[PDB]
């Protein structure tokens, strides 16, 4: 059966029964139906004393058309930890609603490793993404409103960094002209829309410690520049307070469950190129102070997701993960070995060794951070016994690392027990200092070169003029000590999406940079980044319907 | 104290207790925290063929700056009905979010006649306005997308009637250029945004009987024309199913309570000028089958809200009000007598008697449909013992109508027991058949002329060339036997907001028309209409905020 | 010069919702009735609605046909109200220092054109504005 049929057949615990297994009384839950609740601000404030358990990070290899099943391991690992007598919680992101309607939606995991209800996670879960769309739309409205009524701050309509948002796959709103149709309508200007998860408001959501911090951060956001090129903040257009109020309920984390009854938090959903690509700091912190283990993931592979989960999320927060799982599939490694996706059935151990190069770098990159590592191999029936054996051989001989076959997609908890046994071991064993990729009081350009030349394999970096001027501006305006959020393709350690494996001696060209003062990092653009996806020739939407019984078809 | 102080001081019943009072079990309840639940679709379906109770329409005189407390009468009336033993439910409209950040939000009712909780009703509530936005915003996406990939339908970018929506007072988006930025972004068009509330999705949602009816109605909406002027519907772009899927949870009415723990339905919130101004048909229909008495209101006075509530809602759906309550305050009638806002404190001899003519035409107007009326006069501590005594005389002699004093604002339910006894006596008395203003099988022109002459007090109607043309369009194409939705000022029976009281002779100039084929009415435009309102210079947003202890300021 | 004024500092505080001066070209071009201009970000300036008329619609053409001489033409152009400020005060061509440059652009042109009829008699062809939004006569000078 399909992931959806597996989810539909499940008999969910009432969330109060999920909540108990962490210490959460029913009094502390705001139900959304019978199988979802938010955890009330006051209960989460109440946890500032309590000690924190083990944090487990689940990153992966440079993605492939073939799939690697990162999310599936997060849920299976969490299930398995529960099974082997460890009290464990999963931290995950809410997906955008808008892509459900272009291409289809998808499970929170896959097969017998899922977070449910599936249908509600995909659409309007608890209304988080609506609250962010509403917070963002108000600061948009209030910006063009300030300019309409005598433009007191002297906002330069050509220097407004703030864009608008909607959770739809609408290529029409990428670049607009607005405040047209005359005097009563306001001062014409260029503007556009990004998809709601690309909003800096979404970054701040996911990094905020509490409602105090959400407002302090929101008010640092630089929305525009004056004609004389001085900064303008959401605090200048008096937006912070109103936005914080539209996020009051949103900012509570959502408790939900796996197919096997175990607790799972889903909270936040930012990009992993123009933002750090992790779930809300409230979620993982809430996990650490209620469980023995907290399993979370980072968007994309460990060249992008893990670096940011350490250099942005872990650095701001004080958090330090116990251990890191790096997910690989035999199919994925062979694609990084040159095999085209049709030819993936046939044994090719030559292609498997070639693409190990990709895995070999990620392990060596994650270890550079003084963090223990185990390799999760997500099994596939077409995989020969000798392919699995030569990967284990390669991992032991070259990287001195354990390669644990997991079959949790098919067998649930059970398939990930070996991996849970091995994570617990990394956690209990020798704890070293958490190092970072750069010192904070280096030049931004030196933070960029340090990521490109130590982790991507790159010879050098090049800063084009557009960006050189702005980096010179950013460093003069005192944003110099800020972290670096490398916005590039995920499909390669290089900026060329087609260079697979582990390319050395390439050139990383920075085209442009953006400032996210809310989140507290510098966005560094190294390719063409999508912030508003389009719909295909035949959108999933054309076939999304209720049948007779009012079931949803064509969504999965 | 303030409405919000009274609201906050209350201890609310767990929602399943409020539910019990209408025979709804906790199984049928989709909770949104403790104090709100949605009634389940399968539970609403099992009520088909179960017999209807009495239906009470609350309307008012012509709106004034003084205020009338229509929505206070409704919550009063429903609580009082429960005090005196009738099992009663109030239905209301959810308020738009965007206006909260312009002017403040309001109590749903007010004083001791409130539905609660007040913060959530004024903000995201159960994400229904969010669902409609999302649905509206997918329809816009799909239209642009269809043009992008081939434009098989031959849609004319100069002749798309469909606009976009956001739930924000955003003046910047009234007139837009979209699909700019080059080839990959598509075909430059002119576009605009209305507020979410102005959508035909909204008016369709508030009129659909079930999900099957929703889908059929969406799909009849005309969204553009081809270059050769053939009309193109939401069915032609295969939106309807996915719009419905996004609107599934939302079409379930939201169960809330009064400060007295009596059940309250809030669902829907369309405009009362370019729509029918009523709460959802699903809500009032569910109410009727769970309750003896079911109290619902329509926006503006009985010249509009009541008229539309009968000629659109009852007419489409099969419903007949058992009795009508026309709300009136001394302060409003005096204002109709020529008295400015400023001079309302002192007793006024004649103001009341010449302003009464406004109520004199409302009572006559409602009766013209075959409906028993009672005048609810919402008391104020300025009102003398002569002013209230005078109003009753005029009601006794000039009409044959009872004028009952309502102190439900200050006293609570007890101050509308009197009004309750009279509504009972009328509902269980002589029940004449329901007339309508116009016949169905007539020229749309005769339907306008009908309304204006029989109710508005008008001498004739003008049809400008723009409108005359489009009507001829609607008439040949088959939309000739459709109801009419008079978009027009609400402060006057005439088209001139200044002419208070009961003016005769005036002319009703129809400048433009609009087709809502989904809602199945022709919008008829006389006054200037504003589908996207604009924030003030110092909008409420600026002082909206949280305290030290995390309470919301600035919103009331 | 007006958009260039707006672009460098908007010293006159011109409101781009309140520009009455449009553009011209001598071509029946329906594409240019209603434009948005000054697009493509910072170096291209401040976006505003605008449009084109046909050259004869131009007030410059009205002032050319009612000028006595080059001196008169420069004063007349001087007085043209081309926009309003945000505080609703009138802005002229003299405020934007356009008058002298426009005059040298029109100097040779303000000499009337001699030609002849089929029977060799003298004929002056000079100027030609609209007879609806201007007075529809040839030049005074002629």
Nearest CA in chain C to A227: C9
Is A259 found in the same domain as A110?
Answer: yes
A68 is in an annotated binding site: yes
Q: Taking CB atoms and an 8 Å limit, are C46 and A158 in contact across chains?
A: yes
Nearest to C41 among A158, A182, A183 (CB): A158
Nearest CA in chain C to A229: C42
Q: B133 CA to chain A: closest CA distance, Å? A: 10
Q: Taking CB atoms and an 8 Å limit, are B544 and A176 in contact across chains?
A: no
Q: Tell me the C-alpha to C-alpha distance, in Å, between residue B3 and each of B68, B122, C63.
A: 16, 13, 66
Is B327 found in the same domain as B265?
Answer: yes
Q: Taking CB atoms and an 8 Å limit, are A177 and B179 in contact across chains?
A: no
Burial A479-507 (b: 16+ CB within 10 A, else e): bbebbbbbbbbbbbbbbeeeebbbbeebe
Q: Taking CB atoms and an 8 Å limit, are A30 and B34 in contact across chains?
A: yes
Is B456 found in the same domain as B429?
Answer: no
Instruction: Show residues of chain B in contact with A39, CB under 8 Å.
Output: none
Q: B424 CA to chain A: closest CA distance, Å? A: 37
Instruction: Decide if C50 contacts C35 (C-beta within 8 A).
Output: yes
Sign of CA dihedral B64, B556, B124, B172: positive
Q: Taking CB atoms and an 8 Å limit, are A227 and C9 in contact across chains?
A: yes
Q: B155 CA to chain A: closest CA distance, Å? A: 15
Question: Distance between CA atoms of A502 and B291, rounded to whole angstroms?
Answer: 70
B70 is in an annotated binding site: yes
Q: What residues of A act catalytically?
A: 70, 72, 93, 104, 272, 300, 380, 409
Residue B89 resides in a domain:
yes
Instruction: Show residues of chain A in contact with B196, CB under 8 Å.
Output: none
Is A400 found in the same domain as A274?
Answer: yes
Among A155, A187, A227, most C C-beta atoms within 10 A, so best to mutate, is A187
Which token pair is B471? Answer: 């009507």
Q: Tell me the C-alpha to C-alpha distance, in Å, between residue C32 and each of B365, C1, C19.
A: 53, 20, 16
Nearest CA in chain B to A239: B542
B275 is in an annotated binding site: no
Instruction: Give the helix ranges, DSSP H, for A165-246.
Output: 200-207, 211-218, 240-246
Is B421 found in the same domain as B280?
Answer: yes
Burial B470-483 (b: 16+ CB within 10 A, else e): bbeebbeeebbebb
Q: Taking CB atoms and an 8 Å limit, are A141 and B168 in contact across chains?
A: yes
The domain boundary, picked from B396, B416, B442, lies at B442
Question: Distance between CA atoms of B327 and B67, rounded to whole angstroms?
Answer: 11
Closest C-alpha to B275, from B434, B60, B483, B56 = B483
Q: Tell me the C-alpha to C-alpha distance, in Å, between residue A227 and each of A162, A224, C40, C49.
A: 16, 10, 17, 20
The pair phi, psi for residue B542, each rounded to 5°, is -50, -35
B66 is in an annotated binding site: yes
Residue A540 resides in a domain:
no
SS3 B333: helix
Is A74 found in the same domain as A160?
Answer: no
Q: Taking CB atoms and an 8 Å limit, are C41 and A190 in contact across chains?
A: yes
Q: C133 CA to chain A: closest CA distance, Å? A: 22
Q: Which residue has the tokens 């429960």?
A: B82
Question: Distance between CA atoms of A254 and A38, rounded to whole angstroms?
Answer: 4
The structure was resolved experimentally with X-ray
Question: Distance between CA atoms of A193 and A188, rounded to whole angstroms?
Answer: 16
Nearest CA in chain C to A189: C47
Cα R_g (chain B), whole angstroms = 23
Instruction: Show residues of chain C in contact with A147, CB under 8 Å.
Output: none
Instruction: Please tell me which chains touch C, using 3 or more CB pairs under 8 Å as the contact test.
Output: A
Q: What is the resolution of this structure in A?
A: 2.8
B412 is in an annotated binding site: no
The domain boundary, picked from B442, B464, B487, lies at B442
Count Cβ atoms below 10 Å from residue A453 Cβ, excluding itself.
Answer: 14
Is B119 found in the same domain as B156?
Answer: no
Residue B537 resides in a domain:
no
Nearest to A30 among B33, B131, B211 (CB): B33
The pair phi, psi for residue B282, each rounded to 5°, is -50, -45
Which token pair is A452? Answer: 């490109």
Instruction: Show residues of chain B in contact with A172, CB under 8 Å.
Output: 140-141, 144, 178-179, 185-186, 189, 191
Name beta bridge partners: B522: B484, B515
Instruction: Give the helix ranges, DSSP H, for A66-127.
Output: 70-83, 118-122
Instruction: Decide if B448 contacts B483 (C-beta within 8 A).
Output: no
Q: Give residues with Cβ within 8 angstroms of A340, minimum separation 6.
A: none
Is A288 found in the same domain as A156?
Answer: no
Question: Distance between CA atoms of B296 and B75, rounded to whole angstroms?
Answer: 9
The total of structural domains in chain A comes to 3
SS3 C99: helix
Question: Distance between CA atoms of B554 and B546, rounded to whole angstroms?
Answer: 9
The pair phi, psi for residue B403, each rounded to 5°, is -115, 95
Q: Give residues with Cβ within 8 angstroms of B105, minimum separation 6.
A: B95, B99, B118, B122, B123, B555, B556
Q: Tell me the C-alpha to C-alpha distance, in Å, between residue A490 and each of A271, A521, B459.
A: 12, 19, 72
Instruction: Please tell me which chains touch B, using 3 or more CB pairs under 8 Å as the contact test.
Output: A
Question: Distance between CA atoms of A409 and A415, rounded to whole angstroms?
Answer: 8
Residue A400 resides in a domain:
yes
Nearest to A242 among B179, B186, B541 (CB): B541
Q: Provide long-range contacts, Cβ within 8 A and 24+ apart, for C134-139.
A: C134/C56, C134/C57, C134/C59, C134/C61, C134/C62, C134/C65, C135/C62, C135/C65, C135/C66, C137/C65, C138/C65, C139/C64, C139/C65, C139/C66, C139/C67, C139/C110, C139/C112
Q: Taking CB atoms and an 8 Å limit, are C49 and A188 in contact across chains?
A: yes
Q: Taking CB atoms and an 8 Å limit, are A32 and B31 in contact across chains?
A: yes
Nearest to A175 among B169, B170, B185 (CB): B185
Burial B16-37 (b: 16+ CB within 10 A, else e): bebbebbebeeebbbbbbbbbb
Q: What residues of B act catalytically?
A: 70, 72, 93, 104, 272, 300, 380, 409
Q: Provide long-range contacts, Cβ within 8 A and 24+ apart, for A441-448.
A: A441/A480, A441/A481, A443/A475, A443/A480, A444/A471, A444/A474, A444/A475, A444/A479, A444/A480, A444/A482, A444/A484, A444/A513, A444/A522, A445/A471, A447/A483, A447/A484, A447/A522, A448/A484, A448/A486, A448/A508, A448/A510, A448/A524
Question: Distance between CA atoms of A41 and B90, rounded to whole angstroms?
Answer: 32
Q: Give residues with Cβ within 8 angstroms of A343, minimum separation 6.
A: none
Residue B88 resides in a domain:
yes
Count Cβ atoms below 10 Å from residue A388 Cβ, excluding itself.
Answer: 16
Q: Give residues with Cβ within 8 angstroms of A272, minimum separation 6.
A: A298, A299, A300, A304, A305, A308, A490
Burial B149-181 (b: 16+ CB within 10 A, else e): eeeebebbbeebebbbbbbbbbbbbbbbbbbbe
Is B254 found in the same domain as B119?
Answer: yes
Is B403 found in the same domain as B266?
Answer: yes
Instruction: Show residues of chain A in contact with B555, CB under 8 Å.
Output: 245
Q: Taking CB atoms and an 8 Å limit, are C49 and A180 in contact across chains?
A: yes
Question: Distance between CA atoms of B145 and A534, rounded to whole angstroms?
Answer: 8
Q: A186 CA to chain C: closest CA distance, Å? A: 7
The domain boundary, picked from B182, B214, B246, lies at B246
B106 is in an annotated binding site: no
Q: β-pairing, A293-297 with A54-60?
A: parallel
SS3 content of chain B, % helix, strand, coil (to 5): 40, 20, 45
A71 is in an annotated binding site: yes
Question: Distance between CA atoms of B424 and B292, rounded to whole angstroms?
Answer: 10
Instruction: Please tell me which chains touch A, using 3 or more CB pairs under 8 Å as the contact test.
Output: B, C
Question: Distance between CA atoms of A174 and A535, rounded to whole angstroms?
Answer: 13
Q: Which residue has the tokens 């709103």?
A: A173
Q: Which residue has the tokens 């490398």?
A: A486
Is B388 found in the same domain as B448?
Answer: no
Closest C-alpha to B275, from B500, B58, B484, B551 = B484
Residue A420 resides in a domain:
yes
Nearest to C39 among A159, A187, A190 (CB): A190
Question: Distance between CA atoms of C11 and C14, rounded to whole angstroms?
Answer: 8
Chain CA centroid to CA C17, Å: 19
Q: Taking CB atoms and an 8 Å limit, are A177 and B181 in contact across chains?
A: no
What does the angle CA B406 – CA B409 – CA B415 come to, to the nearest 5 degrees? 40
Among B151, B178, B187, B528, most A C-beta atoms within 10 A, so best to mutate, is B178
Among A188, A224, A227, most C C-beta atoms within 10 A, so best to mutate, is A188
Nearest CA in chain B to A238: B542
Residue B539 resides in a domain:
no
Instruction: Show residues of chain A in contact with B180, CB under 8 Å.
Output: 174-177
Which token pair is B538? Answer: 């110092």
B117 is in an annotated binding site: no
Residue A550 resides in a domain:
no
Q: C97 CA to chain A: closest CA distance, Å? A: 23
Phi-psi region for residue B192, left (φ > 0), alpha (ψ -120 to 50) or beta?
A: beta
Q: Taking CB atoms and an 8 Å limit, are C9 and A190 in contact across chains?
A: no
**Domain span holding position A139:** 128-246
Is B525 found in the same domain as B458?
Answer: yes
Instruction: Decide if A474 contacts A509 (C-beta within 8 A).
Output: no
Question: Distance between CA atoms of A356 and A125, rounded to whole angstroms?
Answer: 38
Nearest to B176 among A149, A178, A248 (CB): A178
Instruction: Give the helix ranges, DSSP H, for B411-532.
Output: 417-427, 444-451, 465-476
Which token pair is A375? Answer: 């390799």
Instruction: Show residues of chain A in contact with C46, CB under 8 Å.
Output: 157-158
Question: Distance between CA atoms of A44 and A53, rounded to whole angstroms?
Answer: 16
Q: Give residues with Cβ within 8 angstroms of B434, minimum separation 6.
A: B310, B314, B320, B369, B370, B371
Instruction: Show residues of chain A in contact with C47, CB under 8 Å.
Output: 157-158, 177, 188-190
Among A26, A102, A132, A138, most B C-beta atoms within 10 A, so best to mutate, is A138
Which token pair is B195? Answer: 């507020």
Closest C-alpha to A57, from A360, A320, A318 = A320
Q: What is the DSSP letter of B195?
A: E
- At CB < 8 Å, which residues of chain C contact A? 9, 16-18, 36, 39, 41-42, 45-49, 86
């Amino acid at each position: 059966p399909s992931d959806i049929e597996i989810a539909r057949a499940a008999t969910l615990k009432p969330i109060a029964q999920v909540a108990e297994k962490l210490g959460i009384p029913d009094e502390a839950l705001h139900n959304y139906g019978k199988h979802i609740a938010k955890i009330d601000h006051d209960f989460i404030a109440s946890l500032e004393g309590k000690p924190e358990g083990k944090l487990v990070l689940v990153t992966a290899i440079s993605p492939t058309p073939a799939g690697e099943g990162k999310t599936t391991t997060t849920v299976g690992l969490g299930d398995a930890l529960n099974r082997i007598g460890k009290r464990a919680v999963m931290c995950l992101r809410e997906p955008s609603l808008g892509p459900c309607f272009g291409m289809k939606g998808g499970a929170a995991g896959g097969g017998k490793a899922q977070v449910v209800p599936m249908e509600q996670i995909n659409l309007h879960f608890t209304g988080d993404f609506h609250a962010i769309t509403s917070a963002h739309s108000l600061a948009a409205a209030l910006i063009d409103n300030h300019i309409y009524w005598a433009n007191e701050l002297n906002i330069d309509v050509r220097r407004i960094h703030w864009r608008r948002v909607v959770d739809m796959n609408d290529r029409a709103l990428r670049a607009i002209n607005q405040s047209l149709g005359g005097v009563a309508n306001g001062f014409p200007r260029e503007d556009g829309f990004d998809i709601t998860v690309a909003s800096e408001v979404m970054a701040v959501f996911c990094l905020a410690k509490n409602l105090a911090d959400l407002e302090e951060r929101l008010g640092r956001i630089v929305i525009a520049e004056t004609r004389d090129r001085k900064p303008v903040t959401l605090a200048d257009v008096k937006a912070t307070g109103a936005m914080t109020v539209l996020l009051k309920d949103a900012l509570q984390p959502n408790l939900v469950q796996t197919l096997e009854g175990n607790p799972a938090l889903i909270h936040g959903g930012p990009f992993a190129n123009i933002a750090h690509g992790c779930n809300s700091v409230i979620a993982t912190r809430t996990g650490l102070r209620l469980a023995d283990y907290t399993v979370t993931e980072a968007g994309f592979g460990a060249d992008l997701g893990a670096e940011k989960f350490i250099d942005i999320k872990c650095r701001q927060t004080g958090l330090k993960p116990s251990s890191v799982v790096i997910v690989a599939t035999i199919r994925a490694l062979k694609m990084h070995g040159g095999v085209n996706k049709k030819d993936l059935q046939a044994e090719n151990l030559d292609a498997l060794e070639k693409g190990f190069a990709n895995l070999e770098r990620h392990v060596n990159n994650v270890r550079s951070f003084g963090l223990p590592v185990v390799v999760g191999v997500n099994h596939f029936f077409q995989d020969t016994d000798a392919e699995h054996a030569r990967l284990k051989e390669l991992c032991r001989d070259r990287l001195q690392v354990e390669a644990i076959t997991c079959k949790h997609w098919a067998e649930g908890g059970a398939g990930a027990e070996a991996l849970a046994q091995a994570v617990v071991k990394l956690a209990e064993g020798e704890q070293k200092p958490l190092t970072f990729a750069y010192e904070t009081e280096t030049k931004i350009t030196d933070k960029i070169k340090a990521i490109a030349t130590k982790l991507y394999g790159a010879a050098d970096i090049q800063i084009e003029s557009k960006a050189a001027t702005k980096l010179a501006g950013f460093e003069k305006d005192g944003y110099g000590k800020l972290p670096v959020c490398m916005a590039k393709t995920q499909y390669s350690f290089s900026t060329d999406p087609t260079l697979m494996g582990a390319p050395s001696g390439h050139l990383v060209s920075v085209r442009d940079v953006r400032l996210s003062a809310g989140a507290g990092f510098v966005v560094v653009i190294c390719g063409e980044i999508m912030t508003m996806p389009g719909l295909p020739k035949v959108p999933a939407a054309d076939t999304i319907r209720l049948d007779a019984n009012g079931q949803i078809d064509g969504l999965f």
